[PDB]
Amino acid sequence: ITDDFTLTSPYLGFCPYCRHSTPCFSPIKIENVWDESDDGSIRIQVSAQFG
Amino acid sequence: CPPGDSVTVSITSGASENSCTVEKKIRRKFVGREEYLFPPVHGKLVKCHVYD
Amino acid sequence: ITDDFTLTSPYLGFCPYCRHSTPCFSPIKIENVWDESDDGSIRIQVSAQFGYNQAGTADVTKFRYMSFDHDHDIKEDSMEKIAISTSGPCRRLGHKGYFLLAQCPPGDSVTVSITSGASENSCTVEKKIRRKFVGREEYLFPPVHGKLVKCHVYDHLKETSAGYITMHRPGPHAYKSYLEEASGEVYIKPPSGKNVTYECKCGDYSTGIVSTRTKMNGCTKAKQCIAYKSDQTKWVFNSPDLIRHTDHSVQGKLHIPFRLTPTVCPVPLAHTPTVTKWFKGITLHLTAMRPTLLTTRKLGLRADATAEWIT
Amino acid sequence: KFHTVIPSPQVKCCGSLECKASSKADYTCRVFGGVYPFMWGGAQCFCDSENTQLSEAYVEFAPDCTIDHAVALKVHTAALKVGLRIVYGNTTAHLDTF
Amino acid sequence: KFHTVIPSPQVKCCGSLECKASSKADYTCRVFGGVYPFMWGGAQCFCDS
Amino acid sequence: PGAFGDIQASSLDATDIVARTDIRLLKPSVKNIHVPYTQAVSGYEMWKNNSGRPLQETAPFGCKIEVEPLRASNCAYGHIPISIDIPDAAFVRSSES
Amino acid sequence: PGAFGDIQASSLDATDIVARTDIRLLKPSVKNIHVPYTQAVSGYEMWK
Amino acid sequence: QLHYTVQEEQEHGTFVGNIAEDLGLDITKLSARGFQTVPNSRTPYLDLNLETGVLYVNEKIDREQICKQSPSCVLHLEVFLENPLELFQVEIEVL
Numbered sequence: 001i002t003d004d005f006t007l008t009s010p011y012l013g014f015c016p017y018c019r020h021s022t023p024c025f026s027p028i029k030i031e032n033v034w035d036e037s038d039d040g041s042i043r044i045q046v047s048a049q050f051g
Numbered sequence: 052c053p054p055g056d057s058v059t060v061s062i063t064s065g066a067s068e069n070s071c072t073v074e075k076k077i078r079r080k081f082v083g084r085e086e087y088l089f090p091p092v093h094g095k096l097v098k099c100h101v102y103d
Numbered sequence: 104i105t106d107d108f109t110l111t112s113p114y115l116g117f118c119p120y121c122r123h124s125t126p127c128f129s130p131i132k133i134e135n136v137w138d139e140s141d142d143g144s145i146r147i148q149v150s151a152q153f154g155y156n157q158a159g160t161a162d163v164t165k166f167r168y169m170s171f172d173h174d175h176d177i178k179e180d181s182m183e184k185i186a187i188s189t190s191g192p193c194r195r196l197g198h199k200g201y202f203l204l205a206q207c208p209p210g211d212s213v214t215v216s217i218t219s220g221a222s223e224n225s226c227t228v229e230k231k232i233r234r235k236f237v238g239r240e241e242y243l244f245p246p247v248h249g250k251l252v253k254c255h256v257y258d259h260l261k262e263t264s265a266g267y268i269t270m271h272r273p274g275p276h277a278y279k280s281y282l283e284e285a286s287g288e289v290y291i292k293p294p295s296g297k298n299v300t301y302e303c304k305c306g307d308y309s310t311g312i313v314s315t316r317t318k319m320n321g322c323t324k325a326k327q328c329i330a331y332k333s334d335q336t337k338w339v340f341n342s343p344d345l346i347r348h349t350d351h352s353v354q355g356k357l358h359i360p361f362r363l364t365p366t367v368c369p370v371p372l373a374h375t376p377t378v379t380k381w382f383k384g385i386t387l388h389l390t391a392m393r394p395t396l397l398t399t400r401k402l403g404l405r406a407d408a409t410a411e412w413i414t
Numbered sequence: 415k416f417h418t419v420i421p422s423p424q425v426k427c428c429g430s431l432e433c434k435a436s437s438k439a440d441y442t443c444r445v446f447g448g449v450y451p452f453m454w455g456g457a458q459c460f461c462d463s464e465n466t467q468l469s470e471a472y473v474e475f476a477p478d479c480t481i482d483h484a485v486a487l488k489v490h491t492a493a494l495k496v497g498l499r500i501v502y503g504n505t506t507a508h509l510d511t512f
Numbered sequence: 513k514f515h516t517v518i519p520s521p522q523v524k525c526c527g528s529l530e531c532k533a534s535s536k537a538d539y540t541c542r543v544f545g546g547v548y549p550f551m552w553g554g555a556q557c558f559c560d561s
Numbered sequence: 562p563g564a565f566g567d568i569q570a571s572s573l574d575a576t577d578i579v580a581r582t583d584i585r586l587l588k589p590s591v592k593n594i595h596v597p598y599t600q601a602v603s604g605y606e607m608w609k610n611n612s613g614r615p616l617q618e619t620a621p622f623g624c625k626i627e628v629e630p631l632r633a634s635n636c637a638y639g640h641i642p643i644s645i646d647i648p649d650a651a652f653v654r655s656s657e658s
Numbered sequence: 659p660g661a662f663g664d665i666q667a668s669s670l671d672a673t674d675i676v677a678r679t680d681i682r683l684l685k686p687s688v689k690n691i692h693v694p695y696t697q698a699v700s701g702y703e704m705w706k
Numbered sequence: 707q708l709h710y711t712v713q714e715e716q717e718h719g720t721f722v723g724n725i726a727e728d729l730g731l732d733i734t735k736l737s738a739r740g741f742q743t744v745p746n747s748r749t750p751y752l753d754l755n756l757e758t759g760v761l762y763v764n765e766k767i768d769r770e771q772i773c774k775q776s777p778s779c780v781l782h783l784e785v786f787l788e789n790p791l792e793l794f795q796v797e798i799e800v801l
């Protein structure tokens with residue numbers, strides 16, 4: 001296990017939509033959306049690194 | 052966010068713009084019986100499982 | 104045939120649903136909507152020329168206006184202020200002359216509107232626009248893996264036609280602010296140096312040309328003489344809220360843009376069913392997440408075909 | 415799918431009109447009387463309800479029917495053709511015959 | 513409710529690449545000959561088809 | 562008026578377009594000028610709603626049905642007799658077999 | 659594949675995860691590198 | 707899937723990058739396999755030579771206009787062929 005975050009890096013994904021309705025390369029590829037809360041919450045995994 | 056069919060995420064700068072959508076069937080959900088839209092102020096307190 | 108936009112002018116329409124939900128005369132009246140493409144792109148025909156300056160010298164950031172005035176003149180404004188809407192905003196992606204093209208979400212009305220802050224207006228009509236697909240499996244947005252079927256979509260190219268239009272001579276358009284009646288007679292007040300006709304029949308029929316000279320006659324009512332400006336040069340499409348000229352024959356013809364052409368078009372593939380074997384019959388255990396067509400037929404003399412959309 | 419074109423209405427100031435016969439696709443005309451039409455600048459005539467307007471309408475094809483039309487046919491007496499593949503004594507041949 | 517997890521595809525430039533058999537949950541592994549993959553910079557493999 | 566076939570033409574760019582579609586005018590009431598009308602539903606799109614299944618999945622005996630010459634290609638029924646004129650040079654002697 | 663008992667395990671976090679969910683791969687038709695696949699619907703939520 | 711970079715303030719007829727040799731196509735088969743552009747992805751600043759597959763520039767590429775039209779400041783194009791029915795993207799990034 002680790003949390004030393006300076007040892008990782010973001011990457012480019014490949015998304016089926018883009019800004020203008022075509023599949024193109026993008027740095028904000030969404031990998032997974034998990035939707036099993038009880039007030040409508042949503043956990044998104046992207047390819048970039050927030051925070 | 053409200054229910055829909057896709058989940059979009061986008062940066063809105065102007066120095067760069069991208070977006071990426073997957074289709075994901077989001078619909079609203081309730082707890083127990085008596086389907087509702089906003090949690091009331093007068094009600095019974097039951098057990099939920101929410102995210103932190 | 105022709106494409107000379109230094110010779111046609113925009114005109115005021117009569118839109119059935121203005122911004123105040125009341126039918127008013129508006130320079131942004133839309134007249135036809137076409138939605139037969141497979142990509143959700145529509146083609147709106149407005150009564151204000153797009154992509155041209157005031158004389159019509161084809162720059163791609165200004166549009167002719169046909170303003171409201173006591174006088175009768177045309178003007179122009181920046182292209183950035185035209186927004187198309189059905190059920191939320193949508194995306195302009197072409198304009199030439201009258202027509203323009205946009206890809207808009209499924210709603211029920213079609214709105215175009217200038218968004219200035221000086222002479223702001225809108226105009227809506229009703230049109231059952233909704234989302235369509237190609238093939239046999241239904242989809243939300245086109246996939247990243249599957250077959251390549253051929254679907255027909257609109258060009259975004261300006262200089263392609265699939266169309267034809269009739270454009271002819273303009274009609275007489277009288278005003279009531281060309282007149283004053285401060286005494287028992289009436290006086291014609293033309294604009295500043297124009298040739299203004301009249302056809303007044305109080306007593307007996309009259310005509311003539313008046314160039315900024317207050318004329319009277321033996322006439323006592325304020326509404327028995329009309330007077331319209333005499334230009335008769337520009338051309339207007341036969342919209343049903345104009346008066347025809349006494350000739351009303353074809354003078355020129357213009358291009359409808361945005362040809363409907365064939366193109367290749369990706370489609371999803373579905374999960375191939377597993378099949379159990381029993382006596383003179385298959386049982387196919389099969390999944391889908393969206394409505395997907397299954398059809399079967401025997402290979403004998405009776406086909407006995409079935410078809411159902413399973414979900 | 416058709417396309418209703420409607421040409422601009424003809425108004426005769428303080429007179430009378432009548433329609434002829436045309437030959438366009440579903441021509442339909444009938445006159446009126448007692449109108450008093452207004453434009454953006456009103457009072458488009460000069461006598462109180464003594465005049466007529468005309469009203470004509472017809473149809474033609476759409477500008478998308480060059481892709482979206484439907485060709486009606488009338489078939490009879492189909493005659494069959496067969497492509498064969500004859501091989502005799504390790505020597506093949508390909509034939510197409512009626 | 514399960515969670516289908518796909519690791520990154522191995523690509524070998526003009527050499528046959530068969531895969532082993534492991535004991536994870538529902539392992540499945542097939543080869544595909546004739547690829548020519550593209551990243552953001554094209555031609556990720558130097559050996560045509 | 563109101564079924565398949567209320568527009569007729571020889572070709573699509575022809576001029577002898579004949580049609581009836583129940584277009585009847587109405588008397589205008591409002592002071593602004595326009596022309597009101599009413600018309601039946603386009604029978605072409607009414608056919609297009611509930612056309613049914615095409616005959617690429619209803620034809621008996623199982624055959625692909627092409628369009629551009631209107632074939633009914635490659636299905637199977639009956640027996641066809643033929644007779645083959647074999648050249649006699651492709652034979653061998655019974656004193657050789 | 660397609661009903662309850664789709665994936666099984668003795669404990670919750672143990673590595674004896676016997677499973678069968680009818681996963682099949684597909685040959686990719688786009689020049690971009692990705693791995694297409696189709697799969698049976700989740701058995702536990704169809705039971706749910 | 708391609709990626710090209712056109713330079714700023716380009717004139718007419720300047721060669722940017724060639725497509726047909728990149729993806730294993732022949733010159734005489736381009737007219738046979740129905741080589742056109744996809745109508746939706748066409749750009750006014752780039753026409754195309756349909757016989758050898760080279761990609762020149764039609765109008766004078768102004769950066770501040772299309773940077774604004776597209777705040778990424780890029781360009782997009784798709785071409786297709788019809789005898790095996792394949793499609794592939796071509797991206798152009800003006801700098």
Ligand SMILES: *[C@@H]1O[C@H](CO)[C@@H](O)[C@H](O)[C@H]1NC(C)=O
Pocket residue numbers: 296297298312314
């Ligand atoms: C008005 O008409 C006269 C001829 O009747 C012409 O000489 C004059 O130039 C016209 N005025 C304008 C402003 O066009």
Ligand SMILES: *[C@@H]1O[C@H](CO)[C@@H](O)[C@H](O)[C@H]1NC(C)=O
Pocket residue numbers: 503504
């Ligand atoms: C073809 O048939 C002839 C006689 O029918 C025989 O002699 C010959 O060996 C055969 N060809 C081959 C390749 O075996």
